[PDB]
């Protein structure tokens, strides 16, 4: 019936929506991984600046 096609329509709506939800999940997740690697190289930069600054000060 009209309820059947309405149900299939909201169904495929839920499907595409959860698909895009998991999709942006993955995208923002990759972005968070990149940002974590950024923080890691950042702490590497902190440590290297600290050691070279300390050498200069020595």
């Amino acid at each position: 019936d009209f309820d059947d096609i309405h149900r299939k329509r909201v169904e495929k709506d839920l499907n595409e929506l959860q698909t895009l939800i998991e999709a942006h999940f993955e995208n923002r997740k990759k972005e968070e991984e990149e940002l974590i690697s950024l923080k890691d190289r950042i702490e590497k930069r902190r440590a290297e600046r600290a050691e070279q600054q300390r050498i200069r000060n020595e």
């Binding site: 309820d3 309405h6 149900r7 329509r9 909201v10 169904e11 709506d13 839920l14 595409e16 929506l17 959860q18 698909t19 895009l20 939800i21 998991e22 942006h24 999940f25």
Partner: protein, 55 residues
């Protein structure tokens, strides 16, 4: 987020359709039972008329 809203919308479409069907079925029951009871009353009046004819 994104998918969560769409899933909620699906859950709401199911809500509206189920609630509408329930209300329509309840109206159907009311109408059908009123029909049946009016027919039963007509049957009763026919029984009484038959009784008068028998007298």
């Amino acid at each position: 987020m994104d998918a969560i809203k769409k899933k909620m919308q699906m859950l709401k479409l199911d809500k509206e359709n189920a609630l509408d069907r329930a209300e329509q079925a309840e109206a159907d029951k009311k109408a059908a039972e009123d029909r049946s009871k009016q027919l039963e009353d007509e049957l009763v009046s026919l029984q009484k008329k038959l009784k008068g004819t028998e007298d």
